[PDB]
Structure formats: structure tokens, C-alpha cells
Ligand binder design. Sequence first.
Ligand SMILES: CC(=O)N[C@@H]1[C@H](O)[C@@H](COP(=O)(O)OP(=O)(O)OC[C@H]2O[C@@H](n3cnc4c(N)ncnc43)[C@H](O)[C@@H]2O)O[C@H]1O
Ligand SMILES: [Zn+2]
Length: 277
Amino acid sequence: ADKGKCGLPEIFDPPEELERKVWELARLVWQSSSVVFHTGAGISTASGIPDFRGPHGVWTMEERGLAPKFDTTFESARPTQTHMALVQLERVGLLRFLVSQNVDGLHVRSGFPRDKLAELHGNMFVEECAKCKTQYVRDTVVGTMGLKATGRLCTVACRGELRDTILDWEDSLPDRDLALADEASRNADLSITLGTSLQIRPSGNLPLATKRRGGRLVIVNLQPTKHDRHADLRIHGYVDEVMTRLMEHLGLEIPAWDGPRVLERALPPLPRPPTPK
Ligand SMILES: CC(=O)N[C@@H]1[C@H](O)[C@@H](COP(=O)(O)OP(=O)(O)OC[C@H]2O[C@@H](n3cnc4c(N)ncnc43)[C@H](O)[C@@H]2O)O[C@H]1O
Ligand SMILES: [Zn+2]
């Protein structure tokens, strides 16, 4: 396949411009009915997992004849302030759906409901049965990549071959996840992209489905993105700093993470502060 544009220069918004943009983002969240978030490799860099096309990204370092650096294992990695902010946003009903390109499995481990999440490129902790399609969320990473047999069998008897959910460059996106991600993105009046370069299709094109129906588009990234020209608001800064300032404006606290936990279905929305005039 193609690695795309790697190691592009990073842009940083000054403290004055950044503060005004987070308030503009807060206004867009309060006024929107269907908010869909789009996450990429950048929202995991603050946890010790490198991105792909950033200054020290996997494909950027490969081009330089160097190896990417991991400051953690996927099992010892803890969800960032951004992952936990997204958990709270969903809990208070301010987040309708979450579309992710990340294989790190941090969204599931943070306690985010799996029925409001589309894992387009898979999850390295999730293995699927080839016969009944039943998914298994493991506490450790699945040893195989490229939808290959792991060795373990189904327990629902079915006894079907369990395969990884990691897609190779040539593999097609999962039908259920892509259909739900496309439906949510199309029907959203606000799509916010966090830590994604938006260079890989159809994943990168999903936030544009919002823009096609008069819906608003917000892009939060350090480097420039493929669809920068069609964003209503472009925030250049660290996703953790942007989300921390956002939660403060919304009057929401970032919840504590008490270790890896799996939530299959979303609960009814928890009480949230009243909306400003
Ligand atoms: C293997 C596979 O099947 N698919 C992978 C991956 O799933 C897919 C998606 O790419 P993405 O998720 O956008 O990573 P990025 O291109 O490196 O884009 C990440 C973006 O995050 C930005 N970024 C990094 N840290 C950030 C931070 N703390 N705050 C804000 N932005 C950040 C960075 O500038 C980069 O532009 O590309 C494929 O190689
Ligand atoms: Zn099975």
C-alpha cells in the first residue's frame, strides 16, 4: 500500500488563540444534538504509544532508518486524559458515537461502551470466531495480526477458530463497524477529529459525511490534516490540553481509571450541568 505524507512540521496555537478555540468548541458541543468523535494514533502518544506519521512516528522513523520508541507495552498502557474525557462525555449524553482507527485497545479498556464505538482497524486485545463472529476481549494482546488463527477455540458448542481483528494493508474494513460509523457520521451535526492525520480512507473521509449535510467539522491535530480546508474550527495543540480545557468549560470532571474494564452497552445519560445562554 502507501505510507502517505510522513513527518510534516507541527503547528502550535498560541495560548490566546488556543483558549478562544476551546471556547468555540464548547459552544459547538452545547448547540449540537448528535456529536461524533473520530480518534487516531495521536490521542495515545501521551501514554507512551507512538503515532504513525508524527515527527517520531512509526512510518516516519522507518523512512529515517530508525525504529519507533514505545515507553510502555499495550497491556501496561493507561488511557490518557482524552480517553477518560470521552468516557465522561458519553456518560453525560454529550457524545453520541465514537469512531476509532486505533488498535491499542485503550477505548475499550477505559470503560467506553462497545455499542457506541466502531474499531475500524481492529483491536489487538479482541479476537473473533470465524464461525459465529462472537468477539472476546482479552486482558493481554492477541499474538497474531492480519486476521490469522490464534490457536484458541470458541467457548459459546461452536468450538470455532478464533482469529485476530487486526487488519493488514490489503484487508477490508469490518462491515458492522464501518456501517455503524458511516450511519453515525452522516447523521451527526458535529464531528470532532482528535489525534488523526485523516490520510487513510474510508476512515479519514467519515468526518466529511457530517460536513455534507450542513453539519460542523472540528479538527484537533498538531500536524496538518488531509481535510483541513473543510474544517469549521482547526485546533493546533496537544489533545490532552484541549480536552482538559473543554471539560472545564462544560463543567465536567475527568473520571478516574481503576484498571482495565469492559462495558458492552451504554447506560442512560447521567446528570449534566445546564446549558449556557
Ligand atoms: C496499521 C493500520 O491498519 N492503520 C494505521 C493507522 O490506524 C491509520 C490511521 O492513522 P492515524 O491514526 O491518523 O495516525 P497518524 O497518521 O500518525 O496521525 C496521528 C496524528 O496525531 C497527531 N498527534 C500526535 N500526538 C498528538 C497530540 N498529543 N495531540 C494532538 N495531536 C497529536 C500527529 O501530528 C498526527 O498527525 O494509519 C495506518 O498507518
Ligand atoms: Zn463461535
